[PDB]
Design a protein around this ligand. Structure first.
Ligand SMILES: O=C(O)c1ccc(C(F)F)cc1
Lengths: 237, 300
């Protein structure tokens, strides 16, 4: 069934599982037309498919060409997501295929269930967690590969960089969700926290800066302060 | 016209015959039902006065055999039986029809209700849903489960309705996942009508039999099946025009006959609101929509 705060250690057990977030699949800009009507222009999007235990991110880039001449794009986007996740599972060796797929939005349940009928033993589940995966496009290296794409593409990342050398996947996921929540809440301030100090850089093969263990404590504190600050600004607290 | 005689009526019981019902008192001089219209299937049904548990009954056609009811005191119910030989049967019954102790099937001459509820129902198809080959009549009761219910427990005592499951590989062609899930036409027209039922008459017969078993026995799996068969048509964008017009007639007479006071248990609010106001056929069921809005506006 649904996944929440009671069975949260389940995310980091040895049953292979994937989160699927479809927020950034269908993306548009809205603008006025010469005649004073409104029109959308689609931009490249992506499917965010993550193994929370290993950090492996299967970023499927959704090129605007997949929408050409199609109708009801918000509905189509869920089915396109399900199609692509299904294709990813089928492309993986049996012993790498997930036992569970957790969708961040309940509207993905029927599309993914229907595309996965051939896999009756893979559980398709929602979650009560509010996960900030929509902010993945605030990670500069992910946003860059999506916007530069001229055709459908799948790119593989480890969203935890090398953190699992030093911390558990429970702590790695916690750090990731705090970073993404801060980027979602105040992107400019979050990136300023992350990049202000030039003596700390992002390795060519990484997404985040090379903070020491004590520096990660500092950054994490500054992220929590940002989130609390914005909460106070929002509700006048 | 034909007759279903009773050996006796030893326990007080509410007897149904098609859409009619009457009460018989414990050991009252009741010798059966006479003037049963030839040409239709029928159902004789029972609900004991001292134990409303197990509604049960028998689907029969008087053209297929000579049928009587005797109470079996060991199994505690009224059983249908068949007298193979006509002369013996004709001799026992005429006696009772001369002594006037039979309820007459009360068919009003204007009234087409039973024909309208059973237009497509045939005994031969009933005997395939209800499997008990050594009898020409078919026993059904309140608690009998369907094959689909069993998959989700005795298979001999089950209702073998055609399984309908919108999230099944039978319903969804590989490569057509969104198409087939949002538009059930493939599943209706190729799998069900061309593949399993062969024609719409057989599909409508099963739909009608499911409704009647839900209404007369309170059989839950039968109600599920009735709604599934409605939702399959309404959820299809491509349905022959004659099928939609006949469905409207079938449903109108079903809603017309449903007891007002059983509407909370016999009608699924979700399915009916979907079918009438959201589905592809939301504007194709004018007579049914009109009776539903005027008789059960609460459900909508
Ligand atoms: O065996 C028969 O043919 C038979 C026996 C008893 C009755 C009773 F119902 F009237 C009717 C028919």
């Amino acid at each position: 069934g649904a996944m929440n705060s009671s069975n949260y250690a389940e995310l980091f057990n040895n049953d292979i599982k994937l989160f699927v977030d479809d927020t950034n699949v269908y993306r548009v800009t809205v603008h006025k037309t010469f005649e004073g009507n409104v029109a959308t222009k689609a931009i490249n999007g992506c499917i965010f498919t993550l193994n929370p235990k290993t950090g492996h991110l299967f970023l499927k880039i959704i090129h605007t060409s997949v929408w050409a001449g199609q109708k009801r794009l918000s509905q189509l986007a869920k089915w396109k997501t399900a199609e692509e996740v299904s294709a990813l599972v089928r492309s993986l060796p049996k012993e790498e295929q997930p036992k569970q797929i957790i969708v961040t939005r309940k509207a993905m349940l029927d599309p993914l269930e229907v595309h996965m009928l051939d896999f009756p033993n893979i559980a398709i589940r929602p979650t009560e967690l509010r996960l900030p995966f929509s902010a993945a496009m605030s990670i500069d290296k992910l946003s860059d590969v999506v916007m530069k794409a001229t055709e459908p593409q799948m790119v593989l990342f480890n969203i935890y960089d090398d953190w699992l050398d030093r911390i558990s996947s429970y702590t790695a996921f916690s750090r990731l969700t705090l970073l993404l929540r801060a980027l979602k809440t105040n992107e400019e301030s979050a990136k300023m926290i992350l990049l202000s100090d030039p003596t700390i850089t992002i390795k060519s093969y990484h997404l985040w800066p090379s903070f020491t263990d004590e520096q990660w404590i500092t950054i994490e504190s500054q992220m929590r302060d940002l989130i609390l600050t914005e909460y106070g600004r929002k509700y006048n607290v | 016209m034909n007759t279903v005689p009773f050996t006796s009526a030893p326990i007080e019981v509410t007897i149904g015959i098609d859409q009619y019902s009457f009460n018989v008192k414990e050991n009252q001089p009741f010798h059966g039902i006479k003037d049963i219209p030839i040409g239709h299937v029928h159902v004789i049904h029972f609900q004991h006065a001292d134990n409303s548990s197990m509604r049960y009954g028998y689907w029969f056609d008087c053209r297929m055999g000579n049928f009587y009811i005797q109470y079996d005191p060991k199994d505690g119910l009224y059983k249908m039986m068949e007298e193979r030989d006509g002369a013996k049967f004709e001799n026992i019954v005429h006696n009772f029809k001369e002594r006037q102790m039979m309820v007459s099937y009360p068919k009003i001459d204007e009234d087409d209700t039973w024909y309208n509820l059973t237009e497509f129902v045939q005994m031969d198809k009933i005997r395939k849903i209800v499997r008990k080959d050594e009898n020409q009549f078919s026993y059904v009761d309140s608690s009998m489960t369907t094959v689909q219910e069993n998959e989700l427990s005795d298979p001999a005592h089950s209702l073998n309705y055609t399984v309908i499951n919108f999230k099944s590989r039978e319903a969804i062609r590989p490569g057509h996942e969104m198409e087939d899930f949002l538009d059930k036409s493939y599943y209706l027209n190729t799998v069900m009508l061309q593949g399993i039922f062969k024609n719409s008459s057989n599909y409508f017969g099963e739909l009608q039999f499911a409704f009647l078993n839900a209404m007369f026995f309170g059989n839950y799996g039968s109600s599920l099946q009735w709604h599934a068969m409605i939702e399959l048509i309404c959820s299809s964008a491509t349905v022959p025009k004659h099928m939609l017009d006949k469905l409207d007639e079938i449903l109108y007479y079903q809603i017309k006959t449903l007891p007002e006071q059983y509407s909370d248990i016999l009608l699924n609010e979700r399915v009916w609101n979907i079918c009438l106001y959201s589905s592809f056929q939301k504007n194709s069921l004018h007579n049914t929509e009109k009776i539903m809005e005027n008789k059960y506006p609460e459900l909508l």
